[PDB]
Amino acid sequence: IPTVAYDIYSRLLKDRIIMLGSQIDDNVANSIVSQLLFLQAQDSEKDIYLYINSPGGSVTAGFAIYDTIQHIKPDVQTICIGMAASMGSFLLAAGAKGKRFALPNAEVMIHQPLGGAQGQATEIEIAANHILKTREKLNRILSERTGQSIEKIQQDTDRDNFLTAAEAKEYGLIDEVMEP
């Protein structure tokens, strides 16, 4: 809301800080991707800081952000404040290795995909196969980014799983709890 003429977020973007503070939908992803591409074009070596306070959102919107982070040359540090849940915790784990952080009282939640399907049996089968493939894709990447096996990630996401920042570090979702 406040102005500094920049709004406060535009002012932070000048210092290569991107604030992800909402549900992740296509509009949010389009804006975050555009900010990442802009920052890379301004300086391809300096790293970028992505703050995450997000309950999650669209899996495809989340993957648009995820792939852009992996594509660009700068390191993207990720910093969880408040909560990173679902695709939010997936993006937290996607930051540059060694540069994934959470503040001490931040929460991290991991779970399996949610969705819906209606229609003929054939269509329900297509939707089920699609969401199951999506879960396998997410688990495989989380395995690579955390060092946990795919079987452990599958077991640990069967139901909603809430982690403290310290537990998220032990799990491999972040590298450090940021102390004051």
Binding partner at 150 among ligand A1II0, its own copies, none, C-beta below 5 to 8 Å by kind: none
Q: How many whole angstroms separate alpha carbon 131 and alpha carbon 77?
A: 29
Crossing angle of helices 59-71 and 121-146, rounded to 10°: 40
Name the residue nearer to its own copies (CB basis): 29 or 173.
29
149 is catalytic: no
- The CA-based angle 55-31-53, given to 5 degrees, is 25
Name the residue nearer to its own copies (CB basis): 34 or 149.
34
Catalytic residue among 31, 44, 71, 86: 86
Catalytic residue among 111, 130, 143, 149: 111
CB of 4 to ligand A1II0, least distance (A): 31
- 3-state secondary structure (DSSP) of residue 94: coil
- Asked if residue 153 binds ligand A1II0 (CB under 6 A), the reply is no
CB atoms within 10 A of CB 178: 14
| Footprint on residues 46-65 left by ligand A1II0 (CB under 6 A) | 56, 59
71 is catalytic: no
DSSP-assigned letters across all residues of 48-80: EEEEEEE--B-HHHHHHHHHHHHHSSS-EEEEE
Q: How many whole angstroms separate alpha carbon 49 and alpha carbon 13?
A: 9
Q: 23 near 55, Cβ under 8 Å?
A: yes
- Asked if residue 138 binds ligand A1II0 (CB under 6 A), the reply is yes
| Footprint on residues 99-128 left by ligand A1II0 (CB under 6 A) | 111, 113-115
Binding partner at 86 among its own copies, ligand A1II0, none, C-beta below 5 to 8 Å by kind: ligand A1II0
Binding site for ligand A1II0 (CB under 6 A): 56, 59, 86-87, 90, 111, 113-115, 134, 138
Active site residues: 86, 111
